[PDB]
Structure 1
Amino acid sequence: MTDQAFVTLTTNDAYAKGALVLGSSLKQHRTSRRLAVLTTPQVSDTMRKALEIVFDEVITVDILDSGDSAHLTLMKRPELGVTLTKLHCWSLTQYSKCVFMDADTLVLANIDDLFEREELSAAPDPGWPDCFNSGVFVYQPSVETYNQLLHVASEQGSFDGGDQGLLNTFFNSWATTDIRKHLPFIYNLSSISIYSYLPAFKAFGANAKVVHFLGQTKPWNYTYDTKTKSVRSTHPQFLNVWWDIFTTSVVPLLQQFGL
């Protein structure tokens, strides 16, 4: 399907590693869809070149440029920089439907069945489960929606200073409307929940389709022993999957640009 895409975002090189692992994981699980990544000019040439290989489409978004539609909102609400960049996912009108996935997620299984879903479909956020988590969502690119989101960003901002507040505000019927727009939690499994509610993880986590690495320590912030194939220090399985992909697929890819 050429009209549908997984879309991620990286604003820097550290999250490009995430993007690259995410993109690799989607190919690993044989997505039939396109892979698109939003990048900023802060993403270096080497990461960018690796992104051009992993992703079918690399889109540059520069909200620091006055030519950007979001730039005015950025001036007004500088804290929303990343949010505003992410919102450009709606500008990808070459696609009829996309699954947005943050660069700190990881695909463990084919999730092409998400394209059955409508905008706005997302998994509940743990913590405040009447908000959906904005790490993974099904949306329809539309200039109009983009404009409407930008407008909300400008007028109200984000109740949480991030994209999740803004998205929840805009798509506010999610909690109370249409159970199909609740993606199963396994499609955006918060890495925190994999110890916060451990009995639940043991009961339902073997079914995890997507892991969302939350907390301040991102996967790339870990040390990974390539001999023991495990990250160093508490349930590292997913970190280890991430690092296996990073070591197996991403690093050698990055390395070939040295020549």
Structure 2
Amino acid sequence: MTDQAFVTLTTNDAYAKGALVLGSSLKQHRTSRRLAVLTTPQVSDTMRKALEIVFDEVITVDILDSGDSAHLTLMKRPELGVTLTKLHCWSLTQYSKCVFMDADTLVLANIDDLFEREELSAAPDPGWPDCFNSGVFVYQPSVETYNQLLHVASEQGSFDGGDQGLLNTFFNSWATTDIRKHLPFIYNLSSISIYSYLPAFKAFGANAKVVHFLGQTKPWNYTYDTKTKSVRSEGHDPPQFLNVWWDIFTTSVVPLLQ
């Protein structure tokens, strides 16, 4: 199945760790599709090589270069850099169907069945459920769809300063049209939500297929005690998921790394 892939992004070494963990978990759960990753020149040569091992295809995108299609839009909206680098997943015409996944996610069960959905399928975002979370979405690469996104971005920008605001403004019918485009929450389970309606997490949390480490703090911002096999919560620090992430990092990614 060399026509369908999982696409991610990382513009630095930090998110690269995340992409490496994501990639490893996609293989670990036997995906039959490809694994593709968008990176930038800011990503180190070591992290780049590590990515070439895990990912089937590594695509470099440089929007600071006048040649790049999204370059002039960045001049008008200097704040949308990462957002514009991300929309390039639609430029991946070598693929028919894709599932973009944020570098801060982790797969816990095979999710190849996401490929039955059509553009654009996304799960609800907690906090504001009428907006879908752009961390996990099924889409169809197309230069047209891409140039249209680039236009909306230029014309009105993003109501949230990042991609989710933009992708929601463009695909504004997600909330009210066709329930098939509403991915179940367990395909993009936001790690911080675990305590907003805890009862529901105990009731359905075991069925979790994908964990998104949404928010300020990412898995790589913690420290892991290899001995205890759990995340370090010492000092003024405010778990099972952070551990699964680190387990995969420590066992699969570190050996390969550096």
TM-score range, shorter chain: over 0.9
Which structure 2 residue ranges, 5 or more long, are not aligned?
234-238
| Among candidates 235, 243, 249, match of residue 252 of structure 2 | 249
Q: Give the Cα separation in 2 of the matches to 1:3 and 1:172.
A: 28
Moved over 6 A (4+): none
Q: Give the Cα separation in 1 of the matches to 2:255 and 2:148.
A: 42
Deviation, 1:78, is 1.3
Secondary structure in 2 aligned to 1:8? Answer: strand
CA RMSD of aligned residues (A): 0.6
Q: Deviations over 1:57-100 (max 9, x none)?
A: 00001111111111111111111111100000000000000000
Q: Give the Cα separation in 2 of the matches to 1:83 and 1:197.
A: 30
Number of positions where the alignment pairs a residue of Structure 1 with one of Structure 2: 252
Q: Give the Cα separation in 1 of the matches to 2:151 and 2:183.
A: 26
Deviation, 1:52, is 0.3
Which structure 1 residue ranges, 5 or more long, are not aligned?
255-259
Aligned sequence identity (%):
100
Deviation, 1:31, is 0.4
Deviation, 1:161, is 0.6
Deviation, 1:194, is 1.4
Deviation, 1:232, is 1.4
Alignment of 1:21-40 (within 5 A): 21-40=21-40
Q: Determine if the alignment matches structure 1 residue 130 to structure 2 residue 130.
A: yes
Q: Give the Cα separation in 1 of the matches to 2:189 and 2:197.
A: 12
Q: Give the Cα separation in 1 of the matches to 2:221 and 2:60.
A: 25
Q: Give the Cα separation in 2 of the matches to 1:77 and 1:209.
A: 35
Deviation, 1:215, is 2.0
Q: Give the Cα separation in 2 of the matches to 1:45 and 1:197.
A: 43
Q: Give the Cα separation in 1 of the matches to 2:87 and 2:166.
A: 10
Q: Deviations over 1:181-214 (max 9, x none)?
A: 0000100000111122211111111000000001
Deviation, 1:46, is 0.6
Query: Which stretch of the first structure deviates more once superposed, 195-204 or 51-60?
Result: 195-204
State TM-score, norm by structure 2.
0.97
Q: Give the Cα separation in 2 of the matches to 1:195 and 1:20.
A: 28
Deviation, 1:239, is 0.5
Q: Deviations over 1:2-53 (max 9, x none)?
A: 1000000000000000000000000000000000000001000111000001
